[PDB]
Amino acid sequence: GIIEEKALFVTCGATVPFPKLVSCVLSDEFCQELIQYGFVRLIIQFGRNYSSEFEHLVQERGGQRESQKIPIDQFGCGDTARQYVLMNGKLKVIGFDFSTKMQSIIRDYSDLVISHAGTGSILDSLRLNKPLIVCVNDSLMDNHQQQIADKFVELGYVWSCAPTETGLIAGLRASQTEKLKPFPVSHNPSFERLLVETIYS
């Protein structure tokens, strides 16, 4: 914490609309809890411009925001990235349209990766040896939701969350309360079939 700054990385798949996943990571509890967990640096990635969805919810709380030259060396975001002010400055949110390897820079920089029903993003965290919280969709069978959770909890390096605006932050509470550690196995095809294919898919 002294030498390196902590950061929480959010990424979404194509399973559901991104705009809908914005409110899941800018909720009252989501922001309020993280600043007590040690995640005051929240970086949320997207490929298509959804910056209006971030500014909107800020205006829905009367907060501030500023387009800043966010260091690539530090976070990985570009100069068009926007900083959003939540929780009276206690939560700093960076939004940026990622292009190439900048999304991998922020991944390595971050401590914890959130996958909103993602696919390659799951492989990425498991490849980069980062701890992974995976939020499932509401199209997934309830039995399959628990089935995946059971095995990821057995693993102890991935945490499954329900398809709500509260299941994620519950897992982000469980990231410290419950056993959740960085994925140690660096074998590409190992977690590909083990975790992604067999269990998740």
From Swiss-Prot:
Pfam families: Glyco_tran_28_C (PF04101). Keywords: Endoplasmic reticulum, Glycosyltransferase, Transferase. Its EC number is 2.4.1.141. Heterodimer with ALG14 to form a functional enzyme. GO terms for cellular component: cytoplasm; cytoplasmic side of Golgi membrane; cytosol; endoplasmic reticulum; nucleus; UDP-N-acetylglucosamine transferase complex. The lineage of its organism: Eukaryota, Fungi, Dikarya, Ascomycota, Saccharomycotina. The keyword Glycosyltransferase applies. Its main location: endoplasmic reticulum. It is an enzyme of class 2 (transferase). One of its GO terms (molecular function) is identical protein binding. It catalyses: an N-acetyl-alpha-D-glucosaminyl-diphospho-di-trans,poly-cis-dolichol + UDP-N-acetyl-alpha-D-glucosamine = an N,N'-diacetylchitobiosyl-diphospho-di-trans,poly-cis-dolichol + UDP + H(+). This is UDP-N-acetylglucosamine transferase subunit ALG13. Involved in protein N-glycosylation. Essential for the second step of the dolichol-linked oligosaccharide pathway. Present with 1950 molecules/cell in log phase SD medium. Signal peptide: none annotated. It is found in: Endoplasmic reticulum.
